[PDB]
Design an enzyme around this catalytic site. Structure first.
Site, PDB file in Angstrom:
ATOM      1  N   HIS A 104     179.165 -34.818  78.791  1.00  0.00           N
ATOM      2  CA  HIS A 104     179.471 -35.144  77.415  1.00  0.00           C
ATOM      3  C   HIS A 104     179.513 -36.630  77.244  1.00  0.00           C
ATOM      4  CE1 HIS A 104     180.705 -34.243  73.480  1.00  0.00           C
ATOM      5  NE2 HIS A 104     181.915 -34.768  73.559  1.00  0.00           N
ATOM      6  N   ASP A 147     175.590 -29.526  76.889  1.00  0.00           N
ATOM      7  CA  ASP A 147     176.623 -30.418  76.504  1.00  0.00           C
ATOM      8  C   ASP A 147     177.919 -29.645  76.540  1.00  0.00           C
ATOM      9  OD1 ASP A 147     178.487 -31.699  74.436  1.00  0.00           O
ATOM     10  OD2 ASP A 147     176.914 -33.187  74.738  1.00  0.00           O
ATOM     11  N   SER A 190     178.843 -38.284  70.636  1.00  0.00           N
ATOM     12  CA  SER A 190     179.433 -36.976  70.197  1.00  0.00           C
ATOM     13  C   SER A 190     179.522 -36.928  68.667  1.00  0.00           C
ATOM     14  CB  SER A 190     180.690 -36.586  70.973  1.00  0.00           C
ATOM     15  OG  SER A 190     181.844 -37.336  70.601  1.00  0.00           O
TER      16      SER A 190
END
Ligand SMILES: O=S(=O)(O)OC[C@H]1O[C@@](COS(=O)(=O)O)(O[C@H]2O[C@H](COS(=O)(=O)O)[C@@H](OS(=O)(=O)O)[C@H](OS(=O)(=O)O)[C@H]2OS(=O)(=O)O)[C@@H](OS(=O)(=O)O)[C@@H]1OS(=O)(=O)O
Ligand SMILES: *[C@@H]1O[C@H](CO)[C@@H](O)[C@H](O)[C@H]1NC(C)=O
Ligand SMILES: [Cl-]
Length: 351
Positions: A300, A255, A147
């Protein structure tokens, strides 16, 4: 004994947001010349009010004071061969995310300012310290992250490569693995005022962020854009073409963080089209990224999750794709992007 152990940086001027020392977790594998340095993610904050709420509510991401002494490696950081088929024996480093700046900050703060944003300085510090603990003997340094840490990889990998080349370590091959850090600077499904961190449109978030963090971007990317337009370089598809280091991109086509910043929540037809198109645009940005793994899931992050070996694209797992890439740099596909149009059209999506 099998866990990664914390070291706080010796240089106490390189700090988390609140001025506590930054650090890294390390497990040495003295018979291995491969090193995995992992940059943690977890959003960011781009003004005083939002950084205040994040400090109230998510202090872990702004401070080292409560970090534990050890932590267990998972996924690509695991030392178990069942969980990590090809990298289990590597030297493992986990760099916690305590700068809230997408690893871009490069100044010691002002006393006038209240938070410090030192993400880019942390990485360089960690690398220097590691040189005295075994990295001087490395042949491969894979800089990985999830991320905001995946975006961190794209912003920092060539700087790490340059730093090591400059410090006299020509044998260390620096590479990057960017997971869930490849975002589109797109129009939101429904436009918001930019009032909370997670629902601010992605272009405006970085436009503000970069100024607030005094963020730095790779020089080769910065050169391509006009002065004041450095924000562009936080976007994977814009920074990638000028990267010198090999970088493997892992990106869910849908995502969750992308949908969050796009203010997306049987779906109505407008929303269906916006989602399909988001998947399509991402696919298109990965067309010229030969080493990539992009499944059609709403999820994610993946690379340090214990079940990272379960997802497959065209019959190939992510650790296998990554191994094929490794082998290519030292029949084994490395370019693996789903073409089906809706989240979870891939049966093997995580839950
Ligand atoms: O346990 S380790 O973390 O050291 O990794 C072992 C595997 O690493 C490879 C690289 O795999 S790849 O990146 O997917 O291509 O090579 C590394 O290990 C071999 C054998 O060393 S070992 O102790 O016998 O395991 C080294 O060969 S040698 O120096 O002993 O001749 C490689 O060094 S070198 O290319 O000759 O310089 C070493 O590469 S590296 O230094 O880490 O970059 C795999 O070996 S390979 O298939 O020959 O490339 C190892 O796989 S294995 O099944 O464990 O042998
Ligand atoms: C400590 O880091 C600070 C902030 O980046 C830097 O100004 C200073 O040179 C560093 N000192 C040493 C000895 O590494
Ligand atoms: Cl020690």
């Amino acid at each position: 004994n099998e866990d990664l152990r914390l070291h706080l940086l010796l240089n106490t001027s390189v700090t988390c947001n609140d001025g506590s020392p930054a650090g890294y977790y390390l497990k040495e594998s003295r018979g291995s010349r491969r090193w995995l340095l992992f940059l943690e993610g977890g959003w960011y904050c781009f003004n005083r009010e939002n950084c205040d709420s994040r400090y109230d509510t998510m202090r872990r991401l702004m401070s080292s004071r409560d970090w534990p002494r050890t932590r267990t490696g998972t996924g690509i950081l695991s030392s178990q061969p069942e969980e990590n088929p090809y990298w289990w024996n590597a030297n493992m480093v986990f760099i916690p995310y305590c700068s809230s700046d997408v690893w871009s900050g490069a100044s010691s703060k002002s006393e006038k300012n209240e938070y410090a944003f030192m993400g880019a300085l942390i990485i360089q510090e960690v690398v220097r310290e590691l040189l005295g603990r075994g990295l001087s003997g490395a042949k491969v340094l894979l800089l990985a992250g999830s991320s905001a840490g995946g975006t961190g990889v794209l912003l920092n990998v060539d700087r790490v490569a340059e730093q090591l080349e400059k410090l006299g370590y020509p044998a260390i091959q620096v590479r990057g693995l960017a997971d869930s850090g490849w975002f589109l600077d797109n129009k939101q499904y429904r436009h918001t005022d930019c009032v909370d961190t997670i629902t601010c449109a992605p272009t405006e978030a970085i436009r503000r962020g970069i100024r607030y963090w005094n963020g730095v971007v790779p020089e080769r990317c910065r050169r391509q854009f006009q002065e004041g337009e450095e924000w562009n370089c936080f976007f994977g598809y814009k920074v990638y073409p000028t990267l010198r280091s090999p970088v493997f991109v892992v990106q869910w086509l849908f995502d969750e963080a992308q949908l969050t910043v796009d203010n997306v929540h049987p779906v109505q037809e407008g929303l269906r089209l916006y989602i399909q198109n988001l998947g399509r645009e991402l696919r298109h940005t990965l067309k010229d990224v030969p080493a990539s793994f992009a499944p059609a899931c709403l999820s994610h992050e993946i690379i340090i999750r214990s079940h990272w070996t379960d997802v497959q694209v065209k019959g190939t797992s992510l650790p296998r794709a990554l191994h094929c890439w490794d082998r290519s740099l030292h029949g084994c596909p490395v370019h693996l992007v789903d073409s089906c149009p809706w989240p979870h059209c891939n049966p093997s999506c995580p839950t």
